[PDB]
Design a protein around this nucleic acid. Structure first.
Ligand SMILES: [Mg+2]
Ligand SMILES: [Mg+2]
Ligand SMILES: [Mg+2]
Ligand SMILES: [Mg+2]
Ligand SMILES: [Mg+2]
Ligand SMILES: [Mg+2]
Ligand SMILES: [Mg+2]
Ligand SMILES: [Mg+2]
Ligand SMILES: [Mg+2]
Ligand SMILES: [Mg+2]
Ligand SMILES: [Mg+2]
Ligand SMILES: [Mg+2]
Ligand SMILES: [Mg+2]
Ligand SMILES: [Mg+2]
Ligand SMILES: [Mg+2]
Ligand SMILES: [Mg+2]
Ligand SMILES: [Mg+2]
Ligand SMILES: [Mg+2]
Lengths: 125, 198, 98, 188, 107, 186
RNA sequence: GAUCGGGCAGCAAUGCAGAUCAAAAGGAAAACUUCAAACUGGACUGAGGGGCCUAAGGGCGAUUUUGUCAAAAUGGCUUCUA
RNA sequence: AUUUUUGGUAAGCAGAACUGGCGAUGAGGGAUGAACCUAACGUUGAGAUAAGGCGCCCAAAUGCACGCUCAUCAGAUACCACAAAAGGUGUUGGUUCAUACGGACAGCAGGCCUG
RNA sequence: GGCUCUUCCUAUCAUUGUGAAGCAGAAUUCACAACGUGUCGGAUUGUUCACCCGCUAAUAGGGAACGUGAGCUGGGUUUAG
RNA sequence: UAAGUCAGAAUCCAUGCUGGAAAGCAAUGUCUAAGUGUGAUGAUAAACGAAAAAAAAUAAAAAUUAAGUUCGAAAGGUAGAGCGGGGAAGAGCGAAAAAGCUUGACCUUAACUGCUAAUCGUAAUUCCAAAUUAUCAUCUACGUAAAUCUUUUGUAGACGACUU
């Protein structure tokens, strides 16, 4: 149903921005198309809600118009870091980052390792 | 645009947009096949689009109706006229472009198997405010007397049923191979790859 | 619609064969030979069962026998006469009886 | 393309209005005198533009023309804190094909410049106003006791939640753009 | 033998020449490189050498023939790039695939 | 402008059970089960609690907003419908020519003859869930009973309308079969 | 320290938490404008055929290396195509 | 042709003034087209533009942000191919006067008032 | 100008389904969706028109180089008596 | 009436009807002498993984924001090996444009081992696959079915055409 809302103090993913791939929190809703954004890795921004994706992390400790500092603290106490880090989303994301850094030999390896996973399964026993 | 043959599933696609895309693709060398044309969408009252198609039925070559325009009533051809409209179709180049496109209603034999594709920008859900009016092509071609709607439905159901077979088999076995992937010998290699940046 | 298949009998009399020819008497009259020598009742039944399986409409292929009249033309006529009755299967049974 | 410092990093998100103070004096320019200085607040996109706005209003309001005076200075004003949301009132006169009108408008934004930019876009879209025609009489950052508009007061509550009902698919960079993909997106 | 072993060339498409409604420069072809999308990415190929291969009657024991050129510049903000060849490309070429090659590596 | 949230609250009382799946509403009470399909509106129909049913619409425009209260009210009708049914009485009105009536045992069909002395036969088949009845004491009336408001009101309609008088001043003639009593509780 | 509210409390009287403005004493930083210093990848071009000239540094307007080419090869012609 | 102009109900009518232009003039833009918009021409390559554009025919954004709009006759713009007086509980802004828990509007109530 | 023939318009004469009335019925009038089909026989006049005699569901108004002369006709108009 | 529903016209679309050289498609009769005949040269708006089958739903869900996936991918050799790949016949199934899926004589191939790569001289398409089909030349077969003209009919006709 509707469980995940855009609320004062929401945990949001910044996509399609200079800030893409970065989590943030929402202090105020400016009109219906824009929210006010903050976090440890991001300046205080205004962003069209369009560019953002709701993360299903709601921090009820956050307060309307909270100063950058206090927010950063509350965020830290919440472990957006650990919690998000376990997410299927961030797991996949990191895996991607991994694939990013691979050289000719790395690929080749992965290919021989890929062939083996195939041709070897008959090892019952 | 470089895949050897794209096959698009026109369902829930908007006519004009799917049109322009397929048109460009065509101009630039992509050989396309569109399917399930009867499933394409148009923005407006089914009424309004019937008014419109009627208005078109009304145009004709005066002294000799059997010269020039043929008013085609099947969804396939509706779409086809749509695309031909967006190419320079009297140009030899335009011709080629056209020859690249083939279109059907429902999903005919050669195309059961090949993977059907979607143009994201062309989707009714993507393009149209939810509460605004729309039609499915086959409804229009109904009002204009294309008789095959019922048949196509039946035929589609038939093919849906073959799908459940494919899929189910594919699932069963593909779970069994994932289970035996968790066995010792291979669990090793799995770990090797994960570390490798799976 | 489309023709799925045609089930021919063993007996196709010369005059009907005439249909396929412009002149019967200067021809070696080779028509249907292979249908004769190779004729396997089993297969026919198989075809009829086929029709039962896949078919919407059933028609009988019919024969105007011109030899019964006194006119010049002796070359018969070959018609499709469609069969209207409730169930495809029974249509087929009927057709066969004919 | 000259940005004022208080504009956003993305030029897209807001108009190029900035708020100016311009001040000038009757040309005769007598030395030891204690001149009458005429000062006014204009919204423009330039210093030049601001000067124009200035003079227009000034020649309407008083005897002065430009050959009759001198521009002492043009100083851009900035908004205090871009950390909070504020409700701004604005008082306008604009010119519609029939006649001239006084309007009062409110916007919830982080800047008075933002308040203005939003005001202009709105006035174009809803009223077909021409920028050149628009005259902003007075502008106030609003105290809550003073905010009168329903679409303004609409947003005061902490319990505010928008589900995002429909997500229109928008790839992250261009590098990811494909016309046709092998499976259908979702909304949610 | 089933295929060629390694093909080191990127696939490009020939869009047309650089044109205005009523006018065209046939000196500058336009290509779209596979999986090349924005000006940034196109830039990466700036100096690169590109081939046009086609077949025909035997000329010096080879049934193919060639025109060589280089991608010079980004054309417009999706992935499109001007190419210059030795002989301005024949126009039927438009429907076709050209070979971007990575040869120009310099310090 | 565009409205943020709009809600409407439907009470559910004793002996009523309600089901919302993908906009498809079911209501089962003592008198039976009624279902309706709302697929045409973008509205949110919240999982009903035996107490209530909450309907919400988000990011809406004035036109959209009305669909809420209207879907709601339709539900009100489904509920009240399965609690106490709906009964209508239609008075059968004629000046000179007595309207003659034959209603079947199903209560599913009506024959009307002799309307304005016309020699034509009127045939009206009642909608599903609708039963037509006439007693000895009814004093020239028809009674249409059912759970679903629509099917019953509509059956009444089809009846009243089959008998519209034509090609004469309608204000003098006035023959016809009209609804006397609407929204009765049994 | 002073206001305020789209807080939690509290039955109320009151407290916890905010946000805005902010004394003396301290810290640590962003955006814009202007003006400067410097790195790396491309495209098009090479007109001219000297020993003269100087601000003593150079200027005067491309050089180097390598590969292929005997076969109708290159250029052209007739015809056709886009 | 712009602006100004006289006769004429008016005219792609008939007359005048200043500056152009078209004739005598091509190129890009107004799909199209003498007098509009940019812009004035030797043969040729590059670059960056004007006018105008960038969903496809078509080079270039299905760019990024705002406001407003659903037409069972939508709309889509200079010169340009026409619309008026008059109307609308369609929708959105704004103007000026008003009501409300010292409980309003409306409905149902009940005896102007009252639940 | 008529004859011949085809097609289009709708500012509908009739026919279909309706709304309205100072609509009792009958007849009539105003309006809507609407040409799908039909819209005739003679006096006098070269006639377009006009006027009369009639039948008719009705005897609607128009366009197509004032539709239609290598389709007629030649009465009218406009050479030479 | 805004969503949502009924009724409802000489209207519209169909049904019926006439065309139907739509350079559309199907079923069926017979024939195509001799071979799953070979050789050379060629053309195909586009071969170098030009790789890839769930179905449905976008106000759904217990839960997953992008095919931003997954699979394949080693020397355009030889000798062995053989994970694996492809498949005769016949028998199964399969029809929306029957495209193919199963079994299967057998045909084949990857790790690993040995030879062979270099003088194609610091680049110049990496000319090889698959589906089609033209031309020239030739080897075998010197046959088979049918049509047309010269006749015939008048159910047709200017002539061709048509019925017979
Ligand atoms: Mg009436
Ligand atoms: Mg009457
Ligand atoms: Mg040559
Ligand atoms: Mg002027
Ligand atoms: Mg004049
Ligand atoms: Mg002038
Ligand atoms: Mg001028
Ligand atoms: Mg002259
Ligand atoms: Mg000129
Ligand atoms: Mg140039
Ligand atoms: Mg868009
Ligand atoms: Mg009318
Ligand atoms: Mg009148
Ligand atoms: Mg006469
Ligand atoms: Mg005439
Ligand atoms: Mg005379
Ligand atoms: Mg209906
Ligand atoms: Mg009509």
């Amino acid at each position: 149903v509707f469980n995940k809302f855009v609320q004062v103090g929401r945990v949001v993913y910044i996509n399609y921005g200079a800030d893409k791939g970065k989590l943030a929190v929402i202090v105020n809703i400016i009109n219906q198309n824009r929210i006010l954004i903050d976090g440890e890795h991001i300046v205080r921004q205004v962003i069209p809600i369009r560019r953002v994706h709701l993360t299903k992390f709601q921090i009820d400790n956050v307060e309307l118009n909270q100063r950058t500092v206090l927010l950063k603290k509350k965020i830290a106490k919440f472990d957006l870091t650990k919690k998000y880090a376990e997410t299927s989303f961030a797991k996949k994301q990191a895996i991607k980052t991994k694939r990013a850094n691979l050289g000719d030999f790395d690929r080749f390896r992965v290919m021989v390792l890929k062939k083996k996973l195939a041709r070897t399964s008959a090892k019952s026993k | 645009m470089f895949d050897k043959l794209v096959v698009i599933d026109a369902k829930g696609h908007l006519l004009g947009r799917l049109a322009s895309y397929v048109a460009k693709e065509l101009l630039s060398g992509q050989r396309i096949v569109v399917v399930r044309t009867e499933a394409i969408n148009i923005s407006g009252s089914l009424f309004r689009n019937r008014v419109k198609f009627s208005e078109f039925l009304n145009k004709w070559m005066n002294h000799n109706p059997r010269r020039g325009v043929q008013h085609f009533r099947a969804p396939s051809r509706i779409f086809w006229r749509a695309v031909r409209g967006m190419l320079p179709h009297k140009t030899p180049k335009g011709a080629a472009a056209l020859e690249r496109l083939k279109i059907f209603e429902g999903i005919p034999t050669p195309y059961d198997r090949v993977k059907k594709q979607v143009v994201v920008d062309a989707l009714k859900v993507q393009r149209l405010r939810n509460s605004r009016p729309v039609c499915k092509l086959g409804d229009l071609s109904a009002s204009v007397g294309w008789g095959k709607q019922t048949l196509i439905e039946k035929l589609e159901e038939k093919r849906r049923a073959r799908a459940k077979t494919y899929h189910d088999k594919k699932v069963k076995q593909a779970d069994a191979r994932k289970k035996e992937l968790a066995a010792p010998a291979l669990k090793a290699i799995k770990d090797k790859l994960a570390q490798f940046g799976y | 619609l489309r023709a799925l298949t045609t089930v021919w009998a063993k007996t196709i009399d010369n005059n009907t064969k005439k249909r396929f020819y412009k002149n019967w008497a200067n021809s070696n009259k080779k028509a249907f030979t292979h249908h004769e020598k190779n004729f396997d009742q089993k297969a026919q039944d198989l075809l009829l069962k086929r029709i039962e399986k896949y078919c919407s409409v059933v028609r009988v292929i019919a024969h105007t026998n011109m030899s019964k009249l006194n006119l010049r033309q002796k070359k018969n006529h070959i018609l499709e006469i469609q069969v209207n009755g409730g169930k495809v299967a029974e249509k087929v049974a009927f057709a066969k009886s004919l | 393309v000259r940005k004022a410092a208080q504009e956003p990093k993305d030029d897209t998100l807001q108009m190029k209005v900035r708020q100016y103070v311009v001040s000038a004096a009757r040309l005769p320019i007598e030395q030891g005198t204690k001149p009458e200085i005429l000062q006014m607040r204009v919204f423009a996109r330039d210093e030049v533009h601001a000067k124009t706005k200035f003079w227009y209003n000034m020649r309407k309001l008083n005897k002065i023309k430009r050959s009759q005076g001198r521009i002492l200075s043009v100083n851009e004003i900035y908004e205090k804190s871009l950390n909070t949301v504020k409700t701004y009132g604005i008082v306008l006169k604009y010119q519609s094909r029939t006649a001239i009108h006084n309007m009062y408008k409110e916007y919830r934004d982080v800047s008075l410049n933002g308040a203005v930019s939003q005001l202009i876009q709105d006035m174009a879209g809803n009223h077909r106003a021409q920028p050149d025609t628009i005259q902003i009489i007075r502008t106030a950052t609003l105290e809550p006791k003073d905010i009168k508009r329903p679409a303004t007061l609409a947003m005061r509550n902490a319990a505010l939640k928008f589900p995002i009902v429909k997500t229109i698919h928008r790839p992250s960079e261009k590098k990811y753009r494909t016309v046709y993909k092998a499976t259908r997106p979702t909304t949610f | 033998s089933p295929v060629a072993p390694t093909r080191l060339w990127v696939k490009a498409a020939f869009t047309g020449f650089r044109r205005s409604k009523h006018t065209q420069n046939s000196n500058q072809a336009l290509l779209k490189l596979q999986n090349v999308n924005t000006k940034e990415d196109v830039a990466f190929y700036q100096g690169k050498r590109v081939v046009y291969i086609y077949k025909g009657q035997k000329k010096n024991g080879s049934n193919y023939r060639t025109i060589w050129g280089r991608i010079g510049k980004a054309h417009g903000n999706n992935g499109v790039a001007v190419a210059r060849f030795a002989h301005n490309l024949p126009p039927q070429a438009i429907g076709s695939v050209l070979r971007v090659m990575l040869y120009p590596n310099r310090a | 402008m565009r409205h943020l949230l709009t809600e409407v609250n439907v009470p559910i009382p004793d002996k009523v059970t309600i089901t919302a799946k993908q906009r498809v509403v079911e209501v089962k009470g003592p008198l039976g089960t009624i279902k309706r399909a709302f697929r045409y509106a973008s509205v949110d129909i919240q999982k009903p609690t035996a107490d209530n049913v909450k309907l919400q619409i988000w990011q809406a425009s004035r036109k959209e907003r009305a669909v809420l209260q209207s879907i709601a009210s339709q539900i009100k009708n489904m509920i009240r419908g399965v609690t106490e049914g709906y009964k209508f009485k239609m008075k059968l009105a004629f000046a000179h020519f007595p309207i003659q009536e034959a209603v079947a045992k199903d209560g599913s069909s009506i024959e009307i003859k002799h309307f304005l002395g016309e020699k034509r036969i009127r045939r009206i088949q009642a909608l599903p869930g609708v039963k037509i009845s006439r007693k000895d004491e009814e004093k020239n009336t028809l009674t249409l009973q059912g759970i679903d408001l629509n099917n019953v009101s509509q059956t009444c309609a089809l009846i009243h309308q089959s008998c519209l008088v034509k090609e004469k001043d309608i204000r003098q003639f006035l023959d016809g079969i009209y609804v006397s009593d609407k929204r009765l509780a049994m």
